[PDB]
C-alpha cells in the first residue's frame, strides 16, 4: 500500500492610492 498527497495554496493582494489637491487664489479690479 502506498499513498501520498500534496496541497498548495498561495494568495496575493496589493493596493495603492495617491491624491493631489492644490489651490491658488490671488487678489491684490483683479481676482483669481
Amino acid at each position: 500500500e502506498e499513498q501520498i498527497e500534496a496541497f498548495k495554496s498561495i494568495i496575493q493582494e496589493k493596493t495603492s492610492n495617491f491624491n493631489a489637491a492644490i489651490s491658488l487664489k490671488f487678489t491684490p479690479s483683479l481676482h483669481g
Binding site: 500500500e1 502506498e2 499513498q3 501520498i4 498527497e5 500534496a6 496541497f7 498548495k8 495554496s9 498561495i10 494568495i11 496575493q12 493582494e13 496589493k14 493596493t15 495603492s16 492610492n17 495617491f18 491624491n19 493631489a20 489637491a21 492644490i22 489651490s23 491658488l24 487664489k25 490671488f26
Partner: protein, 50 residues
C-alpha cells in the same frame, strides 16, 4: 497656508500588501504478510492429503 500670496499643497499616500501561503502533505502506508505451510506424513493414499 495662505497669507499675502496664496500657496497650495496636497499629498496622499496609501499602500496595502497581502501575502499568503498554504501547504498540506499526507501519506499512508501499510504492509501485511501471512504465509501458511502444512506438511503431513500421515500414511494414507488419500486421507493424509485430505
Amino acid at each position: 497656508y495662505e497669507d499675502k500670496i496664496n500657496v497650495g499643497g496636497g499629498l496622499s499616500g496609501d499602500h496595502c500588501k497581502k501575502f499568503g501561503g498554504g501547504k498540506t502533505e499526507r501519506a499512508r502506508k501499510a504492509m501485511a504478510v501471512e504465509d501458511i505451510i502444512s506438511r503431513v506424513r500421515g500414511g494414507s493414499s488419500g486421507w493424509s492429503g485430505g
